[PDB]
């Protein structure tokens, strides 16, 4: 299921991380001016998916859009499955 | 002075230290930290260690 969304997410991560984010960083440090603008217009010309803010974090096992936990890298249900199974190291039921 | 010039990215291997016969690639060096940041594999375990030329004797 939802295989197109994972393909889309792959594309945004690939455009943002590898192709760009040297050019975009140089454009942003020019774009903030300190003593219509050409750097803003060039940043418009750069593709939209190159923005890091277009990446939506997805579960690595299921691709769920919501509920992601970034330390584990998985959504809550897969995290609970792996914690109950033992695949997540050091994770146990907290009882304080 | 032996090897008084210091070159970033130069690979030195210490046979006496635990890092012998180990190969690693340094993608990032933290110049703002002012300490050399290499993910040095120590005891067969790869972890980032801050390092200095005065701290470790160059091979």
């Amino acid at each position: 299921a939802k295989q197109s969304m994972k393909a889309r997410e792959v594309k945004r991560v690939a455009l943002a991380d590898k192709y760009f984010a040297k050019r975009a960083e140089l454009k942003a440090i020019i774009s903030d001016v300190n003593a219509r603008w050409n750097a803003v217009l060039k940043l418009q010309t750069l593709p939209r998916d190159s923005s890091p803010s277009r990446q939506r974090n997805r579960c690595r096992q299921t691709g769920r859009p919501h509920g992601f936990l970034r330390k584990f890298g998985l959504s809550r249900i897969k995290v609970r499955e792996a914690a109950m199974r033992g695949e997540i190291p050091g994770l146990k039921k907290a009882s304080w | 002075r032996p090897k008084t010039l210091f070159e970033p990215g130069e690979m030195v291997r210490v046979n006496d230290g635990p890092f012998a016969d180990f190969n690693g690639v340094v993608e990032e060096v933290d110049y703002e930290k002012s300490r050399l940041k290499v993910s040095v594999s120590i005891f067969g375990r790869a972890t980032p260690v801050e390092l200095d030329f005065s701290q470790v004797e160059k091979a």
């Binding site: 330390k71 890298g73 695949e87 190291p89 146990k92 | -």
Partner: protein, 206 residues
């Protein structure tokens, strides 16, 4: 529905963690995704090898995978060629040097995941579920576990209305924490539907 996973509630007290490494926040998700891919390749390649548990322990640079298997001969193969192909495979999935070691599961009728996949494969091959479950519980009670409880669920015997049938012998004290209870679940994709098999085996009180 209302029951906690025995391994999860016992993961520090009695049962051991399957994956044993230290990772900070940068390496945690990458290590875990590599682990899921390593376990998935090892399961699908060793579907006939009677796999029980996959234990992944890594000293950051290297990865060590210990497969607990009822039959070491099929996974070892001819002079370690099969194990070497899996070693190269785990190295390419992990991106780091791999080492695969093999633990023998003596008494496979006591191991939870093995009896789970036995009942699952039987249900796929159209063995009657009462017969398969009764064979499992009597084999475990014979080989010396203190108790076995086997629960089957869903679409039993090609019926439209789903049912959950549980056969119980001996003790499964699930509420007590000392009890070493290996619990596992296997999934049978039968032609009429999905049949889920749940096994608890209480081997002793630790």
């Amino acid at each position: 529905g209302q029951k906690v996973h025995p391994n999860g509630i016992r993961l520090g007290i009695v049962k051991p963690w399957n994956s044993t490494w230290f990772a900070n926040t940068k390496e945690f998700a990458d290590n875990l995704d590599s682990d899921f891919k390593v376990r998935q390749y090892l399961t699908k390649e060793l579907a006939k090898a009677s796999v029980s548990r996959i234990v992944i322990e890594r000293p950051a640079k290297s990865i060590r995978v210990t497969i607990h298997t009822a039959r070491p001969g099929i996974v070892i193969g001819k002079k370690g060629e099969d194990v070497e192909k899996l070693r190269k495979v785990v190295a390419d999935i992990a991106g780091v040097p791999a080492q695969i070691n093999i633990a023998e599961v003596r008494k496979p009728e006591l191991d939870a995941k093995l009896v789970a996949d036995s009942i699952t494969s039987q249900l796929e091959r159209r063995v009657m579920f009462r017969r398969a479950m009764k064979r499992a519980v009597q084999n475990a009670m014979r080989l010396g576990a203190k108790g076995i409880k086997v629960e089957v669920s869903g679409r039993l015997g090609g019926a439209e209305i789903a049912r959950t049938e549980w056969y119980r012998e001996g003790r499964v004290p699930l509420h007590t924490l000392r009890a070493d209870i290996d619990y596992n679940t296997s999934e049978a994709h039968t032609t009429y539907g999905v049949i889920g098999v749940k096994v608890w085996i209480f081997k002793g009180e630790i």
